[PDB]
Amino acid sequence: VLQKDDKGIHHRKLKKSLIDMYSEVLDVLSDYDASYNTQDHLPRVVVVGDQ
Amino acid sequence: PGVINTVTSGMAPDTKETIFSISKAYMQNPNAIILCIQDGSVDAERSIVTD
């Protein structure tokens, strides 16, 4: 029950249930696939630029 | 005329290409003396004068 509350909705479904789990989904897919071909359906907030 | 990494929608497409042909006044001139003018605020690796 404690795992269900903590790892699912701890009174925070949008912010906690699937935001850290999204990071876990990205970490596990980056662990399986070193390339980002599979990670194309998974958006990221990407900061790029010059000097 | 100064070199530009990206032609802007505010400049006609051939602006960098025309500047490069003009830049040959020294690139192909053994008798030319070049004052290379880096911007102090921007980092040394960012400037296009280097190439």
Residue A7 neighbours by CB under 8 Å, 6+ apart: A21
**Cα(B6)–Cα(B19) distance, integer angstroms:** 12
A51 inside 8 A of chain B by CB: yes
Residues of chain B in contact with residue A51, where contact means CB-CB under 8 angstroms, are: 42-43, 45-46
- For the record, the structure tokens of B10 come out as 């505010």
Chain B touched by A48 (CB under 8 Å): no
Experimental approach: cryo-EM
For residue B36, the distance in angstroms to the closest alpha carbon of chain A comes to: 19
Contacts of residue A29, Cβ cutoff 8 Å, sequence gap at least 6: A38, A39, A42
What b-and-e string marks burial along B2-34, b requiring 16 or more CB atoms within 10 Å of the CB?
A: eeeeeeeeeeeeebeeeeeeebeeeeeeeeeee
